[PDB]
Amino acid sequence: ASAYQRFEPRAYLRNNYAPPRGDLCNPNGVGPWKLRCLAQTFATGEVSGRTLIDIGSGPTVYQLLSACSHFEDITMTDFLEVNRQELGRWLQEEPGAFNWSMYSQHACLIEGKGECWQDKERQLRARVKRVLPIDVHQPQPLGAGSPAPLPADALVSAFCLDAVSPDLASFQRALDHITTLLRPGGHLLLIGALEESWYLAGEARLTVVPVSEEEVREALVRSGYKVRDLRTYIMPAHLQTGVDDVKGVFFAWAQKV
Ligand SMILES: Nc1ncnc2c1ncn2[C@@H]1O[C@H](CSCC[C@H](N)C(=O)O)[C@@H](O)[C@H]1O
Numbered sequence: 141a142s143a144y145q146r147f148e149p150r151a152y153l154r155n156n157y158a159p160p161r162g163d164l165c166n167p168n169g170v171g172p173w174k175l176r177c178l179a180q181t182f183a184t185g186e187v188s189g190r191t192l193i194d195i196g197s198g199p200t201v202y203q204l205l206s207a208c209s210h211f212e213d214i215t216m217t218d219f220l221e222v223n224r225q226e227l228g229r230w231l232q233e234e235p236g237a238f239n240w241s242m243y244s245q246h247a248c249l250i251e252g253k254g255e256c257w258q259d260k261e262r263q264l265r266a267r268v269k270r271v272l273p274i275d276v277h278q279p280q281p282l283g284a285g286s287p288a289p290l291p292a293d294a295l296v297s298a299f300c301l302d303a304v305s306p307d308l309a310s311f312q313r314a315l316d317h318i319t320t321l322l323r324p325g326g327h328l329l330l331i332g333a334l335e336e337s338w339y340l341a342g343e344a345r346l347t348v349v350p351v352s353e354e355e356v357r358e359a360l361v362r363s364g365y366k367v368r369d370l371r372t373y374i375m376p377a378h379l380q381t382g383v384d385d386v387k388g389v390f391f392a393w394a395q396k397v
């Protein structure tokens with residue numbers, strides 16, 4: 141965990157959201173696959189409400205694009221100050237923000253509502269009310285009196301739990317912890333790495349718990365979810381680049397009983 145004290149948001153973005161993994165042109169790439177899942181899922185319209193919270197946003201916004209059109213109050217979170225700062229730069233259109241436009245575009249491409257991408261980005265930026273510090277290891281991750289409407293109508297998290305838990309159990313408790321933020325009946329949209337054991341972010345070298353699909357199923361079940369959809373994307377040869385050892389990527393649409 142103290143390893144996260146050397147994490148570099150720029151180097152992370154560059155490693156995971158710039159070419160090649162971030163060249164969205166090939167539909168068989170991982171960025172399209174993620175966006176498509178998110179988009180397909182909301183497009184069902186069974187996932188809806190007023191508030192929503194993103195767990196462990198890090199410096200990234202893509203996980204929220206298709207989403208932001210179904211929830212008026214969006215809360216973003218991360219454990220580091222430096223990421224919350226990077227998010228800020230893009231939320232306020234400040235100088236040196238990261239360019240998510242190619243993502244917004246595909247968001248718009250995939251949803252098929254003929255929306256323009258500036259509209260999408262504007263809708264997001266407006267609906268993100270607050271960026272909050274968070275620790276998923278605490279039994280009350282946000283703290284005591286968090287400015288976040290609780291309980292949330294849904295949650296979204298990508299590459300967080302799997303990335304901050306040393307081992308399976310640690311993962312499992314982390315899940316329990318955030319599931320407390322989710323209203324009963326609410327939805328969890330979860331994305332993470334499959335059989336990833338490390339990944340770089342500049343000077344930082346994070347050690348991670350290589351999870352599998354069945355392990356993710358069993359763990360959502362244990363935390364009290366009905367698994368509505370669980371899908372697996374296998375990382376293709378040319379997307380393996382020595383910033384990590386990830387083998388595939390999972391997406392899960394879970395409902396709290
Ligand atoms: N104890 C903790 N609780 C919640 N998040 C934590 C955490 N420790 C580290 N993190 C955060 O987990 C994030 C993992 S990187 C994932 C970022 C983004 N959701 C993605 O789609 O890429 C990092 O930003 C890191 O700061």
Ligand SMILES: NC[C@H](O)c1ccc(O)cc1
Binds near residue numbers: 161170303340383
């Ligand atoms: N745990 C993060 C890992 O490096 C990662 C993050 C995002 C991806 O699209 C693929 C892999």
